[PDB]
Amino acid sequence: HMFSRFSNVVSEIEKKYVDKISISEIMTKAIEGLLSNLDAHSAYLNEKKFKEFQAQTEGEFGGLGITVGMRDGVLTVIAPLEGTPAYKAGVKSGDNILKINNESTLSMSIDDAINLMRGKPKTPIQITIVRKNEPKPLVFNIIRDIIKLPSVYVKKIKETPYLYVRVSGFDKNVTKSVLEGLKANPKAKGIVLDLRGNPGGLLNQAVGLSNLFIKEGVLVSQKGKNKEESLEYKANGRAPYTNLPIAVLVNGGSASASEIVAGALQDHKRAVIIGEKTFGKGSVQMLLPVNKDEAIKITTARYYLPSGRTIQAKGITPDIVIYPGKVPENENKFSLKEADLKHHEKEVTPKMINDDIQLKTAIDSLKTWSIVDEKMD
Amino acid sequence: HMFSRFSNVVSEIEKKYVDKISISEIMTKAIEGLLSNLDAHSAYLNEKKFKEFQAFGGLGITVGMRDGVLTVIAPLEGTPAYKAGVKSGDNILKINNESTLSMSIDDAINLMRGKPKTPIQITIVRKNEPKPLVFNIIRDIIKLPSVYVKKIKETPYLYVRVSGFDKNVTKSVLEGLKANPKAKGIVLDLRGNPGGLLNQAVGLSNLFIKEGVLVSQKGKNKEESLEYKANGRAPYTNLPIAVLVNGGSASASEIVAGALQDHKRAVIIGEKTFGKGSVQMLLPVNKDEAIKITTARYYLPSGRTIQAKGITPDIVIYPGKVPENENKFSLEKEVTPKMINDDIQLKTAIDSLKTWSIVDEKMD
Amino acid sequence: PENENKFSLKEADLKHHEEEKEVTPKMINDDIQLKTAIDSLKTWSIVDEKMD
Numbered sequence: 001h002m003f004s005r006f007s008n009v010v011s012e013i014e015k016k017y018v019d020k021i022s023i024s025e026i027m028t029k030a031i032e033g034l035l036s037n038l039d040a041h042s043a044y045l046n047e048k049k050f051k052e053f054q055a056q057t058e059g060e061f062g063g064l065g066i067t068v069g070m071r072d073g074v075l076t077v078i079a080p081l082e083g084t085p086a087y088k089a090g091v092k093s094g095d096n097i098l099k100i101n102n103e104s105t106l107s108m109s110i111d112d113a114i115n116l117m118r119g120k121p122k123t124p125i126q127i128t129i130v131r132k133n134e135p136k137p138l139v140f141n142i143i144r145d146i147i148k149l150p151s152v153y154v155k156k157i158k159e160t161p162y163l164y165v166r167v168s169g170f171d172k173n174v175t176k177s178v179l180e181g182l183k184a185n186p187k188a189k190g191i192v193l194d195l196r197g198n199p200g201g202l203l204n205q206a207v208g209l210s211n212l213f214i215k216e217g218v219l220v221s222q223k224g225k226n227k228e229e230s231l232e233y234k235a236n237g238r239a240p241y242t243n244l245p246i247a248v249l250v251n252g253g254s255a256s257a258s259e260i261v262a263g264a265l266q267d268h269k270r271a272v273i274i275g276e277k278t279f280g281k282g283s284v285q286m287l288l289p290v291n292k293d294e295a296i297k298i299t300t301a302r303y304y305l306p307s308g309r310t311i312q313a314k315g316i317t318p319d320i321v322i323y324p325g326k327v328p329e330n331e332n333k334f335s336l337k338e339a340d341l342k343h344h345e346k347e348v349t350p351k352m353i354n355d356d357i358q359l360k361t362a363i364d365s366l367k368t369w370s371i372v373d374e375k376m377d
Numbered sequence: 378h379m380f381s382r383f384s385n386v387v388s389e390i391e392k393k394y395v396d397k398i399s400i401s402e403i404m405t406k407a408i409e410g411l412l413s414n415l416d417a418h419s420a421y422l423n424e425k426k427f428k429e430f431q432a433f434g435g436l437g438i439t440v441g442m443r444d445g446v447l448t449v450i451a452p453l454e455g456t457p458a459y460k461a462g463v464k465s466g467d468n469i470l471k472i473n474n475e476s477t478l479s480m481s482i483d484d485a486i487n488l489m490r491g492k493p494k495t496p497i498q499i500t501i502v503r504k505n506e507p508k509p510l511v512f513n514i515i516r517d518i519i520k521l522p523s524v525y526v527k528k529i530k531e532t533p534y535l536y537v538r539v540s541g542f543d544k545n546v547t548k549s550v551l552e553g554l555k556a557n558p559k560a561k562g563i564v565l566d567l568r569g570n571p572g573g574l575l576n577q578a579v580g581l582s583n584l585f586i587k588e589g590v591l592v593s594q595k596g597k598n599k600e601e602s603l604e605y606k607a608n609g610r611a612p613y614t615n616l617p618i619a620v621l622v623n624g625g626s627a628s629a630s631e632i633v634a635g636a637l638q639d640h641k642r643a644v645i646i647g648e649k650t651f652g653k654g655s656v657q658m659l660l661p662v663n664k665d666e667a668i669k670i671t672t673a674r675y676y677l678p679s680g681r682t683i684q685a686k687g688i689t690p691d692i693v694i695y696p697g698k699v700p701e702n703e704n705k706f707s708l709e710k711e712v713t714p715k716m717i718n719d720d721i722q723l724k725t726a727i728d729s730l731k732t733w734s735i736v737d738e739k740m741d
Numbered sequence: 742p743e744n745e746n747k748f749s750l751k752e753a754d755l756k757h758h759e760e761e762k763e764v765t766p767k768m769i770n771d772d773i774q775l776k777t778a779i780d781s782l783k784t785w786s787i788v789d790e791k792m793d
Contacts, residue, residue, distance in 0.1 A: 002400055007380060009408050009662050016660065018416070018597055018671045026411070027382050033410020034403070038390070132746055225397045245788075269791045272784055288393060291385045300393050319787065320780045325742030328773060357742065361780060368784040445751045468755075478751060507755060 006030070036109065039299055040070035041285055043109035047293040053115070054295075062146040063117040064125075066091060067199035068110060069255065069281055075105060075113070078279050079199045079253030082168045083149045085142045091129065093197070093253035093279075098137060099128035111297060121145045150174075151198070154181030156347045162190030162366050164348045164359075167209070170201025170257050175208040182241065189244065190366040193262075196249045196275060196358070200256030203284075210264045211235035213271075215242050219264045222284060224301035231301075245369035246271035247362040250318055255281035259316045260303060266316065267306040273318035274362045282311025322361055327354045383407075408668075416671045418657055424665035429487070434519025436489040438463050440481055447481060456519040461512050466504030493517050526553035528711045534562035534730055536712050536723075542573020542629035547580040554613075561737075562730045565620035565633075565643075568722070572628020572653060579605045582636045585618065585643075587611045589678060591636045594656065596673025617733035618643035619726045622690055627653030632675055635688055639678040644729050645690040647722060654683025692729060697721035743770075 010026050028046070035042040045053060065084040068077050076096050080087040099105050100116050119125065126141035151168035163185055167174060182191070203220070210219045217235025224230060248262045248271050259278045265271035282303045289295040303311050353360050390403060398406075405423070412419035422430060437453030447468045452459040469484060471477055477484050488495055497516040500509055523546045525538040535557060539546055554563070575592070582591045586607045595602040620643055622634050631650045637643035654675040661667040675683040700721040717724055750756050769776050 002404070003384075005663060005666075006383065006404055006408055009411070009668060012660060012662055012668065013415070013670065016670060016672060018673065020597070023379055026415075027379070029414045030383060030407060030411040031386050033412075033414040034386075034390070034407045035410075037406050037410040037413070038394070038403075225395050269787055269793075272787050283395075288389055290389050291382060294382075296386065296389065298390065298393055299395055302395055319783055322776075323742050323744050361777070364777065365780065365784045368781045369788050372785055372788045446755070478756070 035296060035298065036107070039283075040073070041110060041283065042296065042298045043111045045287075045295045045297065050289075050293065050295045053111075053287075059148065060121055060146060061118045063119055063121075063144045064142065065146060066117070068097070068113055068117075069279065070110060071096075075108075075110070078255055078281065079197045081199060082151060082197065084147050085145050089140060089142050090138075092131070093251075094132070096130040096132075097127055098130050101125060102128070117144075119144045150177060152177035152181065154178070154185065156185060156188070157353075157363065158347055158349055160190070160363065160366075161188045162192060162363055163188040164194065165191050166194040167258075168194075168198045170198075170205040170209070172202075172205070174201070174205045175212060178209065179212065179240065189370065190363075191241075191244055191246050192359070192362045192366065193246065193248045193271075194359070194362075195254050195258045195262055196251045197253035198258035199253070200258060200281060203257060203260065206257035206260045207233050207235075210261045211239070213239060213241055213244070213246065213265065214268055215239040218306045220260055220306075221304035222301045223304050229301075245366050245373070247365045247369075248273050249358055249362055250275045250278050250316055251324075251358075252276065252279055255279035255315075259311055263305045263311060263316050266319070272320060272365050273316055274320045274322070274365060275318050275358055276321055276323060277317055278315040280311055280313050280315035282313070282315075320361060320365060322357055325357050327357050327360050329354070412668060412670070418655065418669070418671060420669045422659065422667045422669060427661075427665055427667050430659065430667075433490050434493065434517075434521060435485070436516060437519055438467070440469075440485065442481060445478065447478060453519065453521070455521060457515045457517075461514050463514075464503070468502055468504070470500040470502045470507075470509075472499055489516075493519075524549035524553060526550075526556065528557055528560075529727075530711055530713050530717070532562070532727075532731075533560040534564060534727065535560045536564050536566070538566040539630075540570050542570065542577045542581075544574055544577055546573070546577055547584065550581065550584065562617045562734065563619075564723070564726045564730060565618065566723075567626040567630040567634060568621050568623040568647070569625040570630040571625065571651075572630060575629060575632070575656070578629040578633050582633050583607050583611060585611060585613055585616075586636065586640050587614050589640055591678070592632050593676040593678075594673045595676055596656075598673075601673070615737075617730055617737070619646055619730045619733075620644070621722055621726050622647035622650050622688065624648060624651055627651035627687075631683060631688055632677075635677045635683060638688065638691070644692065644733075645688065646692045646694060646726050646729060647690045648693060648695060649689060650687035652683055652685040652687035692725060694722055694725050700724065 010023065010030070013026055014023065032044040035044050064080075064086045066077055066080045066086045068075065070076070074096050076094060077091065079093045080091045097105065097113075100113060105113060117125075121144050123144045124141050125144060126139060128137055128139045130137045150171050150173075151166060152171070152174050153166060155164040155166075157164055163182065165178060165181065167178065182188075203222075207219055211217060214235045215237065217233075219233045219235055221233070222231045246265065248265060250259065250262050250273055254262070255278055259280070259282075262273050262278070266273045283299045284301050284303065285297055285299050287295055287297055305311065353363065387400070387403060387407075391398075391400065409421045412421045434456065436458055437456030438458045439450040439452070441448045441450045446466065449463055449465050449467050452463045469477055469481070472484055472488065475483065484499075493516055495516065497514050498511070501512050501514060502508065502510055521541055521543065523539060523541045523543045525540070527536045527538070529536055535554060537550065537553065539550070575594075579591055588607050588609065591605045591607055593602070593604050618637065620634050620637060622631070622645060626634070626647075627650060631653065634645055634650070638645045655671050656673050656675070657669050658672050659667050659669050677683065697720060700718055702718050717727065764775075769779070
């Protein structure tokens with residue numbers, strides 16, 4: 001029997017125990033061992049965990065509101081959601097959240113961390129971050145105050161028609177919000193999507209946002225392994241803005257939907273991705289009830305871009321790659337003109353364009369598009 | 378039957394997972410998860426690992442790998458590496474195109490210990506000359522300094538450093554102590570020395586303690602649980618002792634320290650110990666497989682377990698960045714004042730040894 | 742600008758195992774303006790490919 005080896009091993013444990021626990025525990029620690037040893041994101045749900053995760057839902061218990069993911073085995077936060085207390089703190093993407101509540105988080109299921117972040121909004125919680133930049137495993141606490149914020153908002157640009165449009169999380173009406181904002185400024189001839197630092201969102205909104213700017217459309221493919229269950233998304237015919245120049249921004253703090261929409265455009269040559277590589281959260285997971293009063297959480301399909309590639313590990317490699325930094329400024333005043341010369345708040349300001357270079361190069365890449373468009377009359 | 382849960386789960390992991398794995402690799406991925414999740418030290422050994430473990434001195438150069446570069450800290454005198462004069466920074470560039478410098482695992486694990494008779498011409502390069510070189514380095518089985526007696530500068534105390542509890546530490550200690558037998562003090566150095574044969578630790582303990590129980594290995598089984606009790610032939614029942622422990626001391630090195638402390642037969646000087654109080658015997662389960670599992674725990678004569686709890690030294694003290702050496706004092710064959718002053722742990726060991734001598738006199 | 746914590750090479754003189762014949766990134770990174778020009782050319786190429 002191919003199945004024999006497991007029962008043979010467990011039988012040995014029964015007689016050469018060092019603890020005192022029945023076969024129930026050996027089975028429980030066997031299954032939970034398998035899931036964590038198969039893929040990073042999976043986890044087990046016993047009767048209690050399944051019961052307390054099946055139905056509970058409320059806005060208050062959202063908690064810090066940050067998002068978490070697995071890098072290579074060491075847990076790391078992917079990006080703090082803009083405006084949350086963690087965002088206002090020193091939390092930054094790419095760091096390893098070693099412990100929560102002074103509890104060793106190493107080799108612990110990610111869904112447990114997600115549950116731990118949940119709690120009453122007015123409750124302090126400590127975290128032992130680890131920043132590769134520094135040699136000290138810094139520690140800091142912050143209250144669980146939950147903030148709900150539609151990150152969608154259209155800000156004009158002072159001296160250009162181009163529209164700044166930040167999407168830092170796909171809520172239920174991100175598509176409607178962006179459509180209304182863009183419609184409010186018909187005169188504009190440019191969009192610079194700042195998907196930077198956007199941990200992710202729900203696919204039924206990223207697909208709509210991508211459909212907004214594409215006519216024919218083969219957006220994403222949630223394939224999996226069952227050929228009969230493979231799903232392919234296609235953008236409908238309508239495309240209100242199928243000609244506006246675009247320039248997307250992406251950094252390591254954006255994954256899942258934030259590289260579903262960015263990746264989709266890059267493959268349709270419908271925009272130029274600017275910034276640096278993304279995290280690469282390219283898998284989906286569902287909660288499958290397995291046995292009586294229990295369930296598991298296992299990846300079921302990987303996201304496929306139009307060109308057939310996968311976001312699981314490679315991420316998105318932006319066409320124009322530039323790391324954040326302050327824009328160089330003029331320093332010298334040359335003698336351009338001499339004696340005997342001949343004669344004859346609520347908007348994005350040049351200061352906020354200057355302090356950061358990634359937004360200065362995204363607007364520049366819109367100017368070249370305008371020039372090329374004018375060359376065709 | 379009771380195997381319903383795993384059988385029901387393995388079906389879902391077979392139909393819904395995205396990579397379409399087989400029922401064999403999943404099972405190899407299941408029991409592997411069980412042991413790793415059972416106890417921290419447990420591990421699964423397949424047939425390949427079985428033959429590897431079944432079938433011994435290392436090259437001896439301390440591969441610190443500091444800042445990625447394989448920087449040698451100190452070679453071992455027993456190996457020809459010391460004879461050649463391997464200097465700090467010497468690098469093993471590559472064995473066979475694997476770029477060992479990126480991560481040195483395979484070389485040390487299975488080329489230095491396994492088959493020591495390998496032709497040693499492994500891209501001999503130096504810090505000052507990256508190009509390949511020839512230094513006529515030879516490799517073979519290497520003796521280790523499991524016992525190292527350096528005596529002391531001017532006092533009747535014998536510095537005894539044991540780096541590993543191998544089967545011959547007891548006889549070497551006997552010979553060393555019998556050398557300069559007139560000395561009336563001993564300083565054990567267990568700093569490091571992760572462990573060794575339990576029988577050897579019991580022998581070293583019997584070398585001092587007279588009649589009490591040294592170590593107990595009850596574990597769980599009502600049978601087995603064999604006790605070890607001292608014997609009346611303890612040669613030195615009154616010679617002062619002062620053992621030095623550290624975070625790097627565990628297993629054998631912490632059951633000797635624990636036994637002496639519980640009998641009040643020595644002074645434990647140092648810091649908290651690791652706590653490697655567990656015995657793990659490989660157990661074949663199939664024709665070509667075996668599993669390593671915790672089998673028994675070590676309880677001390679007082680009864681306290683050697684868990685991660687470890688041992689709390691009597692005189693807590695740290696190695697010391699700045700010993701008492703430069704605080705405005707003015708107005709090679711043995712242990713001279715130099716290395717005594719280099720670290721404060723040995724200084725405190727010798728100091729605590731002296732008080733014992735004085736107390737011996739007040740009562741004699 | 743660049744962000745890095747440890748040398749990309751193990752050492753400046755180790756692990757590395759006609760210059761005018763073509764530009765190389767080491768000289769591009771010295772002059773931000775040439776980098777911006779290459780970025781503008783890349784945007785032009787992407788825009789031109791959008792007309793297929």
